[PDB]
A paper describes a structure:
Using the catalytically inactive His168Ala mutant of this enzyme, we were able to determine the crystal structures of ternary meta-AAC0038H168A•apramycin•CoA and the binary meta-AAC0038H168A•acetyl-CoA complexes. The TxΦHΦAE (where Φ = a hydrophobic residue) sequence motif was previously proposed to contain key catalytic residues of this family. Similar sequence signatures (residues Thr165-Glu171 in meta-[name]) were identified in all analyzed members of this family, with His and Glu (His168 and Glu171 in meta-[name]) along with two glycine residues (Gly122 and Gly158 in metaAAC0038), completely conserved. The meta-[name] adopts a dimeric structure with a buried surface of ~900 Å2 per subunit. This enzyme also forms a dimer in solution according to the size exclusion chromatography (not shown).
Here, we conduct a comprehensive functional analysis of the Antibiotic_NAT family of aminoglycoside acetyltransferases. AG resistance is primarily conferred by three classes of aminoglycoside-modifying enzymes (AMEs): phosphotransferases (APHs), nucleotidylyltransferases (ANTs), and acetyltransferases (AACs). AMEs permanently alter the AG substrate, preventing them from binding to their target, the A-site of the 16S rRNA in the bacterial ribosome. The fold typical of the Antibiotic_NAT family is evident in all structures, composed of 13 α-helices and 8 β-strands, and determined structures superpose with pairwise RMSD’s 0.8–1.0 Å between 197 to 266 matching Cα atoms.
Author numbering:
A (entry chain A), B (entry chain B): 4 to 263
Write the structure that this text describes.
């Protein structure tokens, strides 16, 4: 079975992508199977479906390891985060690099939370991304909710849905672990070390498993409010951003009130 | 032992890179070893050594496979070669992709022979790349010789020195295999299939081994006119482009006169 730009576009329309949509995609590209024009056919087909005014996103992050950021002897040899040159974290697969290196793509400024975006509103989604609490309202994720966008899990494991970290941020529950770290960025065109602060997106709230995002998504799909479908050979899920965030905040806040 | 932008720069100086140099690099990056800022440190270090007027090149090619290209049923789903969008052939390693996706880089128009270039003369090296016989004088390889540039095998096996296919083009020896194939390119901004003609660069001249480039390089190094040295943990070779081509034309033409 071989996918084409044409056939991938019909698979994306079948799962629910439509004209003007903004969609953040998480992908395990190897699950799509054989593609005539390679994985670029997927991005091209998406843009065919949503049109030039739509926007595709991918979770770029960057490749600074904590083993490295923290080892002080290597401190001066670590390049600053540069949203135009820092490659995406390889843990998130080729897909965000695919977007980031496509002509016309943009990438936001908050390093660990940084998002790549292409399409009509890429300038809007990537701009004014808060350095601290980069998963809150002033981020591509918060604008995805405001713009009533969607999340596509393209063969990706369901617990890699980064949008639910934005739910973690909004949700009121006790003893949110705050994380503080120091990373090099650009200030006035020069490398500067800056202290960051965010809610922890690396580990779950104490008392839930590392993969509980997957459970939340499966509960949301159980309500019938999402859509499952095949993109190429990859089993995929399309959910509305605003609904799943409200769903996830609800879940987290109720779980929080079960404390003593 | 970990490499840095600084330490790779000193390694590149030790092997013979100098201000203003134009260097086409073939790389097996995995055996550079650990690099603090990843393989982009190598390119940054090269640019530190050669300066903004120097030029780094990598051999991009592109990804259209003969299986697909030849298959008539998928001919219409095969995207045209776009020097701005078509990713590098993956069996040349990450290095040409690394250059091609670096801001400011350029890429030439002859698909199978196409070269990515960044630096002071990148416009000149990538301009006017002949579609037929893309390894002859009107190519980045011909301009490398004219500019008296260099080739650096950065941990790469010596028989991957594509510059020697330019020597194959020049060398007068009998019964050169001519290759004819068709491939989709951009004409007037739209996809058009075009027939191509070149000397064979995928198979050696009848009567030589698939890796005879390696033997030529090793015998050139035995004249004393190349330099060996380690870039990071990778065994590397630096040769002048003009001399090795003249050396290889000599070798091929003498081998050709042993017929009859
Ligand atoms: C809680 C959080 O926030 S987690 C953060 C977000 N994480 C994510 O979004 C990740 C979602 N994906 C996953 O979790 C997947 O399981 C991941 C990526 C580990 C693994 O996915 P897999 O498909 O192995 O890998 P990936 O998605 O990179 O696809 C690889 C396909 O690349 C194509 N590809 C990669 N690079 C290129 C290229 N340069 N040119 C052409 N094709 C390429 C290939 O077909 C490659 O596979 P191959 O190695 O067989 O050739
Ligand atoms: C006849 C002809 O004309 S032949 C044509 C020319 N051919 C060439 O120039 C190829 C020369 N190289 C070779 O032959 C080598 O043996 C090749 C590439 C097969 C194999 O090289 P190897 O190092 O495996 O592979 P490569 O050079 O791609 O280095 C790989 C890695 O680089 C860095 N890497 C790759 N992608 C990224 C990325 N996205 N971000 C950061 N680093 C990356 C990594 O460390 C990745 O390795 P890992 O998988 O261990 O993490
Ligand atoms: Cl309740």
């Amino acid at each position: 079975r071989v996918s084409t730009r044409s056939s991938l576009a019909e698979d994306l329309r079948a799962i629910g992508l439509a004209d003007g949509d903004a969609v953040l995609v998480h992908a395990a590209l190897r699950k799509v199977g054989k593609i005539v024009g390679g994985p670029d056919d997927i991005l091209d087909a998406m843009r065919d479906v949503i049109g030039p005014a739509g926007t595709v996103l991918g979770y770029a992050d960057w490749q600074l390891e904590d083993e490295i950021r923290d080892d002080p002897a290597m401190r001066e040899h670590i390049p600053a985060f540069d949203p135009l040159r820092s490659r995406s974290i390889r843990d998130n697969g080729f897909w965000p690099e695919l977007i980031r290196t496509t002509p016309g793509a943009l990438r936001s400024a908050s390093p660990g939370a940084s998002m790549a975006a292409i399409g009509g509103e890429a300038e809007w989604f990537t701009a004014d991304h808060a350095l601290d609490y980069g998963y809150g309202p002033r981020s591509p994720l918060g604008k995805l909710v405001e713009a009533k966008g969607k999340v596509l899990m393209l063969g990706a494991p369901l617990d890699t849905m980064t949008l639910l970290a934005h739910a973690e941020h909004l949700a009121d529950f006790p003893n949110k672990r705050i994380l503080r770290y120091e990373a090099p960025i650009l200030v006035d065109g020069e490398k500067v070390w800056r202290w960051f602060e965010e809610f922890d997106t690396s580990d779950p709230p104490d008392g839930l498993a590392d993969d509980y995002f997957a459970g939340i998504v499966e509960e949301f799909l159980a309500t019938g409010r999402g859509k499952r479908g095949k993109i190429g050979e990859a089993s995929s899920v399309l959910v509305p951003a605003d609904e799943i965030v409200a769903f996830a905040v609800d879940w987290l806040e109720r779980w929080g009130r079960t404390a003593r």
